[PDB]
Amino acid sequence: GGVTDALSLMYSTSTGGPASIAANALTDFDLSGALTVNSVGTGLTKSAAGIQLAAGKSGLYQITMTVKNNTVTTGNYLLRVKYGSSDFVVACPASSLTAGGTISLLIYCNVLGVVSLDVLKFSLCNDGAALSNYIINITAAKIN
Amino acid sequence: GGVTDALSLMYSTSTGGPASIAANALTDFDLSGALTVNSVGTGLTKSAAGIQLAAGKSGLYQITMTVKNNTVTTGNYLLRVKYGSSDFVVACPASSLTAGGTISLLIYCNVLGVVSLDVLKFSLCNDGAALSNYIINITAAKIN
Amino acid sequence: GGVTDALSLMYSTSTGGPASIAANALTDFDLSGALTVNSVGTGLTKSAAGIQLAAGKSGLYQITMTVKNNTVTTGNYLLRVKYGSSDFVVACPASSLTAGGTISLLIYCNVLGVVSLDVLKFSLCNDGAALSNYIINITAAKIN
Numbered sequence: 001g002g003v004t005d006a007l008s009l010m011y012s013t014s015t016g017g018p019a020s021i022a023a024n025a026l027t028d029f030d031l032s033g034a035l036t037v038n039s040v041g042t043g044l045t046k047s048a049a050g051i052q053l054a055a056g057k058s059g060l061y062q063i064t065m066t067v068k069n070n071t072v073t074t075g076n077y078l079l080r081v082k083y084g085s086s087d088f089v090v091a092c093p094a095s096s097l098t099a100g101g102t103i104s105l106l107i108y109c110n111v112l113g114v115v116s117l118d119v120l121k122f123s124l125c126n127d128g129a130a131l132s133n134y135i136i137n138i139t140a141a142k143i144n
Numbered sequence: 145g146g147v148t149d150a151l152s153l154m155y156s157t158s159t160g161g162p163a164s165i166a167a168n169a170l171t172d173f174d175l176s177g178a179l180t181v182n183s184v185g186t187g188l189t190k191s192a193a194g195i196q197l198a199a200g201k202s203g204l205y206q207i208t209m210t211v212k213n214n215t216v217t218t219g220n221y222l223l224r225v226k227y228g229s230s231d232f233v234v235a236c237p238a239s240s241l242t243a244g245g246t247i248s249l250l251i252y253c254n255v256l257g258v259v260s261l262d263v264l265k266f267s268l269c270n271d272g273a274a275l276s277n278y279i280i281n282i283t284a285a286k287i288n
Numbered sequence: 289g290g291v292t293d294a295l296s297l298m299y300s301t302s303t304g305g306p307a308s309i310a311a312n313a314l315t316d317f318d319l320s321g322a323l324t325v326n327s328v329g330t331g332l333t334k335s336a337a338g339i340q341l342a343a344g345k346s347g348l349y350q351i352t353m354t355v356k357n358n359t360v361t362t363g364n365y366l367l368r369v370k371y372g373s374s375d376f377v378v379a380c381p382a383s384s385l386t387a388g389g390t391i392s393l394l395i396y397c398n399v400l401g402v403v404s405l406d407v408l409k410f411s412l413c414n415d416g417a418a419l420s421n422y423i424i425n426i427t428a429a430k431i432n
Contacts, residue, residue, distance in 0.1 A: 001148055002288040004289055006204060008252040026385050038204070038252040040288060060294060060326070060429060062206065062287075062350065064250040066232045078386050086425070088354045089386035095271065097170050098222050098233035104248040104392040106352040106427050108296040108326040127383065137230070139250050141204060141287065143350075143429065144290040144328060145292055146432040150348060152396040182348070182396040184432060206350065206431075208394040210376045239415065241314050242366050242377035248392040281374070283394050285348060285431065 005043030006141035007051055009034040012134060021131040026080050026123040031138070044140055050121040051140055055113040060106060060144040065122055067136045068100040075128030077101030082121040083109055094126065100134075106143070149187030150285035151195055153178040156278060165275040170224050170267040175282070188284055194265040195284055199257040204250060204288040209266055211280045212244040219272030221245030226265040227253055238270065244278075250287070293331030294429035295339055297322040300422060309419040314368050314411040319426070332428055338409040339428055343401040348394060348432040353410055355424045356388040363416030365389030370409040371397055382414065388422075394431070 009031060011017045016033025031046040043057040053061075063081055077092045079101050092101030101124065111118045122138055125131065153175060155161045160177025175190040187201040197205075207225055221236045223245050236245030245268065255262045266282055269275065297319060299305045304321025319334040331345040341349075351369055365380045367389050380389030389412065399406045410426055413419065 001146070002289070003204070006288060008204070024385070040204075060291070060296070060328075060427070062250045064248075066249065066251075068231060068233070076381055076383070078383065080386065086423075087356060088390055088425075089356070089380075089388050090390045091381040091383060091386045092233075093220055093235040093237065093381065095220070095222065095235060097168070097269075097271070098224065098235045100233050102232055102234045102247060102249060103390060104250060104352075105354065105390060106350045106392060106429060107354075107425065108427060125385075127385070135230075137232075137251065139204070139252060141250060143287070143431070144294060145290070147348070150432060152348070184348075206394045208392075210393065210395075212375060212377070236377075237364055237379040237381065239364070239366065239379060241312070241413075241415070242368065242379045244377050246376055246378045246391060246393060248394060279374075281376075281395065283348070283396060285394060287431070 003040060003141045003143055005041035007044040008038040008139040009046060010037050011136035021125050023125060023130045024127045025125055028121045028123045043142055049119045052115060053109060053111045053118040055111060058111045059142050061109050061140055062106050062143050063140045064104040065138045066102045067124055067134055069131045069134040070099045071133045072126050072129050072131060073099045075126050077126050079103040079124040081105060147184060147285045147287055149185035151188040152182040152283040153190060154181050155280035165269050167269060167274045168271045169269055172265045172267045187286055193263045196259060197253060197255045197262040199255060202255045203286050205253050205284055206250050206287050207284045208248040209282045210246045211268055211278055213275045213278040214243045215277045216270050216273050216275060217243045219270050221270050223247040223268040225249060291328060291429045291431055293329035295332040296326040296427040297334060298325050299424035309413050311413060311418045312415045313413055316409045316411045331430055337407045340403060341397060341399045341406040343399060346399045347430050349397050349428055350394050350431050351428045352392040353426045354390045355412055355422055357419045357422040358387045359421045360414050360417050360419060361387045363414050365414050367391040367412040369393060
């Protein structure tokens, strides 16, 4: 029961994020300064590159990244998660009622045992405006 | 193997939902009358407020809410899930082929032991028309 | 710890997919030729119909289907997953930064013990152009 490894982070201008996330561009997030909301095991850890997967941790991972930036209600929020040669994306139309976006994924991750390569990379933006009032949550859990 | 708590519901005009979900607005759903499709354990239960998390159930939760309302193929379906001070959203462009939307999340939930506060709240609508022919499925499972 | 059954596939023109996925239409995918990236247990297997659920495997399933087709950056990527009488959809606006889409679901699956009926069906397209340079990943795991 439960999972062997998991990491949940809260990313904001106050907790490790850029003072302003540029519009219409996807630059991977430095998560070293992110606030750890919950941590399980030691297989998943935050770093300047994203979320590191410890050696020997190949398997299935459930990942979710969400964002709310209530002061930006136009354009589309673009979200992206990368691991190795794979990248996953989604675009979420903004509105006052939905001032943000969400991306969730269940994927298989092969861990080579090379720290700089075995890392989940995260990024998002709004295609029409910079974000400087965002609350981003990133959670990853090894389910097998 | 398996999860300790889970709840899967089917929400419609015949099973607890409003006769008509207003357009372009997000009013949290009363799930007391929702049809229970599957239930595991007793940590997650349906209520007029949404889905209650029993005391002592802090942890990671996988959540999914989907909707199909085939007679509304225009505008954007707006979906929202809330827990405590956090809210998660997504907008899904409608079409005849995709007359609805989907929102899935893996999040950490802190349970304070205050029933009225420890509740997952759900809501959705179409930003251009009311929904009165919808099939909404909401499933939550505690994975850690 | 871990899941009892899971299947992760990589679908492309080189690994079982159509030479060209027609625009604005959703025809279920023949996954018999998909590349198996990871397999756990024997409850979930690829077939010409989609992903078969073995008899006695009723329960909760976490499903994700993603697509990247970098040469198609316009219109909306439409994704759909079906099981029995239920269908789940999402539309994802394309862009150069998000040339694809994502759909993830946690749903309850009742297995009748009728192979042709107990199958997860998958489909996607772009509503404005055919796809002939796609990398589609489909992963399903029985979590309870």
